[PDB]
Ligand SMILES: Nc1ncnc2c1ncn2[C@@H]1O[C@H](CSCC[C@H](N)C(=O)O)[C@@H](O)[C@H]1O
């Protein structure tokens with residue numbers, strides 16, 4: 310039900326979450342240590358577990374209520390741990406092969422995003438990968454209205470309950486998005502040697518940075 314609603318609200322959910330899973334699987338070993346930052350109910354972690362049965366997952370979020378859903382999702386999984394922490398708090402030491410995030414980092418001020426990317430690189434192994442599945446701003450107000458129309462078109466085509474879309478729009482008023490190429494450049498500024506946009510559907514994009522390759 311919850312997973313079905315996320316697909317209704319998020320254009321190209323399968324392409325964008327699937328691209329995050331595929332780029333991690335091509336970048337890290339079967340036995341990778343992975344941090345899911347702002348894991349919420351653990352949706353991105355779950356997609357990774359499906360592909361990587363032998364990976365160690367650490368799910369981190371500031372919300373105990375969201376992580377209770379992650380605890381239920383991963384009830385019988387002996388290779389999943391949960392950490393309660395704000396993005397702004399000290400990150401877990403690691404090292405990690407991958408740090409992943411979906412629809413969470415846009416809740417930080419821009420300066421805090423730039424600093425977070427730098428702090429993430431510090432806990433990555435050499436060659437390690439950072440992946441973000443993210444809500445991104447259009448480069449102009451005119452294109453932002455077109456991004457919004459395309460988002461609405463997906464939500465309508467997906468037969469989304471009107472009250473859930475209204476609730477979704479209200480939550481997005483608190484978001485601090487920026488365009489995908491600005492935050493990809495912030496990965497270069499943070500000292501990632503390669504950064505790329507893997508996949509994109511207007512307002513939603515999957516991008517990654519590599520710590521040495
Ligand atoms: N400053 C912050 N520090 C940590 N978690 C934060 C945060 N601001 C927002 N979050 C978390 O970010 C999540 C956004 S919803 C996305 C959840 C999950 N990654 C998914 O893909 O479905 C929520 O779980 C919320 O509690």
Ligand SMILES: [Ca+2]
Pocket residue numbers: 412413415416480481484
């Ligand atoms: Ca949000």
